Amino acid sequence: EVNSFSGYLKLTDNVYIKNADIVEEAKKVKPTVVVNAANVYLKHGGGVAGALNKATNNAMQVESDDYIATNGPLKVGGSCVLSGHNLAKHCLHVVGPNVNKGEDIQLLKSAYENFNQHEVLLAPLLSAGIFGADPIHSLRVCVDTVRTNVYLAVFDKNLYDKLVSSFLE
Ligand SMILES: CC(C)[C@H](Nc1ncnc2[nH]c(-c3cn[nH]c3)cc12)c1ccc2c(c1)S(=O)(=O)CCC2
């Protein structure tokens, strides 16, 4: 019943990967921590963040606005811990660089370093999709940076297959 991840492929001693929607994984597993692919103002307008917010019936967005009002925006490469709502005990909101908006890809290492404060995490592939990072590079940074136990859900079988073949070269 605790962190019941199923059907993952173990890549390294601490990195696992599955072709799955992170929202569906969070509902089934109810992990201790789910990672959001956030932006600095925690505006969950689309993609992974919009999907996680919609699964909380907008409770994540209201909580996020209150956090920003009191604390100000996050930095690129930084994170904050807020409620997991019905998806997890906690949501770790992590800001990976948006290369399509000119942010430095080197900050992807700092973004993955936030994962090391949590023993077990369900997470998306940071800075992939419309953030513009090369998803094979993002997996290599994950493997080289994260030391705690991370379960990556990648919602695209074509990309999943390319990432596993890239890792097993
Ligand atoms: C690479 C892609 C396959 C992957 N997507 C996903 N990966 C895992 N669980 C997912 N659920 C949905 C979904 C459910 N309902 N609606 C959307 C998407 C999703 C991905 C990973 C990272 C990032 C993005 C996208 S982005 O374009 O949202 C920008 C932020 C970084």
Resolution in A: 1.1
Q: Name the helix (H) or strand (E) containing 34.
A: strand 33-37
Is the CB–ligand 1 distance for residue 97 below 6 Å?
Answer: no
String of b and e for 58-84 (b: at least 16 CB within 10 Å)? eebbebbeebbeeeeebebbbbbebbb
Domain boundaries, the chain: 3-167
126: left (phi over 0), alpha (psi -120 to 50) or beta: beta
Burial (CB count within 10 angstroms: exposed 0-12, middle 13-18, buried 19+), residue 140: middle
Experimental method of this PDB entry: X-ray
CATH topology of domain 3-167: Leucine Aminopeptidase, subunit E; domain 1 (3.40.220)
Is the CB–ligand 1 distance for residue 22 below 6 Å?
Answer: yes
Q: What is the DSSP string of 37-99?
A: E--TT----SHHHHHHHHHTTTHHHHHHHHHHHHH-PPPTT-EEEEE-TTT-SEEEEE----G
Distance 155 CA to ligand 1 centre (A): 6
